[PDB]
Amino acid sequence: PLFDFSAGECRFYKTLSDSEYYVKDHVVHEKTVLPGAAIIEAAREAGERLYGKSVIKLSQVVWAVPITVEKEKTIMIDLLPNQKDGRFVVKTDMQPEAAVHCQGNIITCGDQDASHTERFQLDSWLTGQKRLISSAECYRDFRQSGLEYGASFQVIKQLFIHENAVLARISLPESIHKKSGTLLEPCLLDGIFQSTTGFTSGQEDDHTAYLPFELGELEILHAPSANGYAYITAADDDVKRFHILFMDENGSVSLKIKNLALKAL
Amino acid sequence: APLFDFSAGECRFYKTLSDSEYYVKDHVVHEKTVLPGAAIIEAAREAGERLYGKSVIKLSQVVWAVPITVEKEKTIMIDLLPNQKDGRFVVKTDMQPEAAVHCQGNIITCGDQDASHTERFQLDSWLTGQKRLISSAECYRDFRQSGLEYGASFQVIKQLFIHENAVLARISLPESIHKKSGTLLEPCLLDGIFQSTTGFTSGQEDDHTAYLPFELGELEILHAPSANGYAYITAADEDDVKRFHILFMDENGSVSLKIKNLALKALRAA
């Protein structure tokens, strides 16, 4: 580029539809709602478009209650420059008094940024578990809580419940067509969030639905695999906090989630 | 493709220009280094492709004020405002409303399913029979007489063929520097296309008026222009403002750029 501009503020617009799989198959208390994870990928795409470089981190994310999407609904993502980085604000109504559905910081990688890799020792966590939760149990419990995940979002195949950790096997369904540009598939990322249910499910009498409320940091080391494992620990009421690593079957870590907070709905 | 294919709203882009850059350093107008008007066109094109994520195929209804002077470093602001699928651009260096608009115009993007069409020009007949042939050295001496001192980067006119109702200019970019692959409209190429109107605007031998870009009805980009080619200039017609149509093409007449109603305006020395 002969003129390598610095971008100022910019608003991006997208009309969501319940025709899209990430809406129609995400039913919360009998309503189709945009998953909070989808807002993360939308912010990442807007940032990559405006700044012309990879977004490697999203931090200090805060969610309101999910955006309900019945037929069409237009969302606005406002990107505000913060030095080389940016911050985003997501709304559906324009007036200043209107609710912010999601907000957070965008961090881009620089031209000379270094390559850093992380590896997880998976083997010991595939055996010795206290309890094993099958996909069928996991999503029956979710539905009894009011979280009716369609097949596209049924990505958890097994939960290994250990004493102080949960290992979740995750696999994207063949049905969804994953675009080359889509780094964070909403169903993948929501399934990573879902896997905290290995902790929050609790008693058989408890049918509480927990949804994303805050996220300290999401770090992208590289494009996530369609199949892999999430390793979840409690970060340490109505709010539950966790750290999560997402990795491929050989322990190559693709995503790091620090301080994911979910709140009872 | 992107899972979220956004429509972009308004956005401002910022660039600090320096007279260290060749497209400024070698563009001296009445003893001042000024940003060429042609350079703003490529800047608007680049901003548009960045913001809209689609090829810019046309810039239309462009209006220029007097050139932006650049002594050491100066920051320009390009404001892109949405116009349905298309866009509008406004170029400023000063922020307040009272400040001058240096350049403005419309940006038109291409669609995903737009058709493929090519245009060719019968070039050969215009390389002979001319009333007058003007050499590169003569061309830039005449420019200097008017206060337009083009440095080596902008000395892209190699020959002007002066015909009765048309001018054919042979244009060739200098070896010095290679346009980045991403730069579609190299400022020195596009300014040379603007320069070639001097085959008309020179006028009388005693007249040494400098004409600079003032308006541009339409610039259509059919495909990436060649570094070497020919400009075919005709008078739009219809004293201080001269209007032209221009085609830019390669040696086989393959048209890469179409210019409708380029208006140049006399600029008096300070």
Structure report:
- Two copies of one chain form a homodimer.
- Chain A has 265 residues and is α+β, with helices and mostly antiparallel strands.
- Chain A has one domain.
- Helix content of chain A is 16%, strand content 42%.
- The first copy, chain A, is built from five helices and 15 strands.
- Chain A has helices at residues 21-24, 36-51, 135-144, 186-194, 197-200; strands spanning 6-17, 26-28, 31-32, 55-63, 72-82, 85-91, 102-108, 131-134, 147-149, 156-161, 166-171, 210-220, 227-234, 239-247, 253-264.
- In chain A, helix 2 (36-51) crosses helix 4 (186-194).
- The A-B interface holds A 1-14, 41-42, 45-46, 49-50, 52, 76-77, 179-182, 186 and B 1-15, 42-43, 46-47, 50-51, 53, 78, 179-180, 182-183, 186-187.
- Strand 1 (6-17) of chain A pairs antiparallel with strand 1 of chain B.
- Chain A: The active site is at residues 26, 190.
- Chain A: Residues 1-113 are annotated as: N-terminal hotdog fold.
- Chain A: Residues 130-265 are annotated as: C-terminal hotdog fold.
- Chain A: Involved in some intermediate steps for the synthesis of the antibiotic polyketide bacillaene which is involved in secondary metabolism.
